[PDB]
Amino acid sequence: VNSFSGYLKLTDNVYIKNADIVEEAKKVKPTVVVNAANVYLKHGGGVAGALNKATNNAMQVESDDYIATNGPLKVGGSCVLSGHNLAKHCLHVVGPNVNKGEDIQLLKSAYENFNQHEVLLAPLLSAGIFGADPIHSLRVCVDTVRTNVYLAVFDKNLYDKLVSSFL
Numbered sequence: 001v002n003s004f005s006g007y008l009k010l011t012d013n014v015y016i017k018n019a020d021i022v023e024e025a026k027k028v029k030p031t032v033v034v035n036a037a038n039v040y041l042k043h044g045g046g047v048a049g050a051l052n053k054a055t056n057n058a059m060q061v062e063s064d065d066y067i068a069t070n071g072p073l074k075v076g077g078s079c080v081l082s083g084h085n086l087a088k089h090c091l092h093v094v095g096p097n098v099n100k101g102e103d104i105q106l107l108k109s110a111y112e113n114f115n116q117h118e119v120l121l122a123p124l125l126s127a128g129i130f131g132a133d134p135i136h137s138l139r140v141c142v143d144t145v146r147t148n149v150y151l152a153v154f155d156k157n158l159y160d161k162l163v164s165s166f167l
């Protein structure tokens with residue numbers, strides 16, 4: 001038993017809720033919150049800009065040092081950094097960005113990063129301003145992630161559609 005509240009059970013291990021992921025993180029203080037990152041860890045908008053704003057830009061400062069030392073991530077890759085005031089850790093995961101013309105197939109590789117963590121609070125990878133179909137992202141999530149994932153979906157109308165169309 002954990003502290004996530006009001007989630008809907010989709011499968012044995014995947015749960016979903018209409019909520020702002022930053023607000024969920026503040027309340028639950030999960031061990032791991034997932035960021036919808038890009039390879040440069042430039043957190044300007046969407047989930048990434050949201051999480052970074054809530055950290056008062058500390059996430060961006062830490063990320064800039066990470067990139068200066070290690071260089072960019074790979075599309076489909078990830079790194080673990082601090083969760084600051086939101087979580088113990090932030091797993092920065094890079095899903096493909098269709099609006100950048102990136103390869104849709106890398107979405108499964110991106111979700112495989114979640115399997116390294118027993119429990120995560122996460123967004124749907126490649127959705128929103130990354131350009132992919134959220135219904136597809138949810139399908140790849142359920143078919144790839146074996147650990148316990150609590151998905152926060154910002155948009156109410158999208159949430160309702162994700163639940164109603166889930167196979």
Ligand SMILES: O=C(N[C@@H]1c2cccc(O)c2C[C@@H]1C(=O)O)c1ccc(Nn2ccnc2)cc1
Nearest residue numbers: 020021046047050123127128134152153154155
């Ligand atoms: O971009 C966000 N989310 C994504 C989104 C939005 C629309 C359609 C989608 O498919 C997706 C995928 C993901 C989701 O499902 O939420 C987001 C932005 C700000 C925020 N917090 N915030 C607001 C103002 N200041 C801070 C929280 C989330």
